[PDB]
């Protein structure tokens, strides 16, 4: 008969539109209370820290987060910058290149990514 496929429907439709959705919702609310929940979008999860440290352990990605990464010979760059600043230093100015860069790198933003203290 044209029916006889409803034997499959009477099991599949209740299953996949009631049992599977209910199990999925229960599993989702259970997953919501894991410490790993939404670790890719929610800040301050343990797995995020472990993944970042694992990336940092790779020899290629050691100095990857540094915005100044790339200077093949930073000593040459610093020496050239110091020489160029010496010829342009205003009168009896007492600022050197080294401490100027050191104090231009050190800013005061305590409340930046402070969420790296729980997980």
């Amino acid at each position: 008969k044209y029916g006889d496929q409803r034997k499959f429907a009477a099991v599949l439709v209740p299953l996949t539109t009631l049992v599977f959705p209910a199990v999925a919702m229960g599993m989702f609310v259970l997953y919501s209370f894991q410490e790993d929940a939404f670790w890719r979008i929610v800040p301050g999860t343990k797995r995020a820290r472990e993944l970042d440290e694992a990336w940092r352990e790779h020899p290629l990605f050691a100095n990857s987060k540094d915005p100044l990464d790339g200077l093949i010979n930073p000593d040459d760059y610093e020496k050239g910058l110091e020489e160029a600043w010496e010829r342009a230093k205003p009168a009896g100015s007492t600022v050197t290149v080294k401490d100027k860069l050191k104090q231009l790198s050190k800013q005061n933003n305590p409340h930046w990514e402070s969420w790296r203290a729980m997980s």
Binding site: K1, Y2, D4, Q5, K7, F8, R40, L51, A54, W55, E57, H58, F61
Partner: protein, 79 residues
Amino acid sequence: RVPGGKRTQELGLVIPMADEDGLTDGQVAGLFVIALVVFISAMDLAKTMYNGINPAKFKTSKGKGYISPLVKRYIENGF
């Protein structure tokens, strides 16, 4: 069937139904086996995408990695 819409009634459009079954239960089961294979593979893929790449595998995993000889050529051919 109780038709609706002007055109179906004024043209006599009908919807034939096969008196046979279509697919036998064996064929449906054969399709469901491969559907289950897709399902298992998709769950595995979802797990892998959720966890993402593990860079620290070189400290624990065996072997020494491999770059295919064409991948090297593609590396040095440019970008």
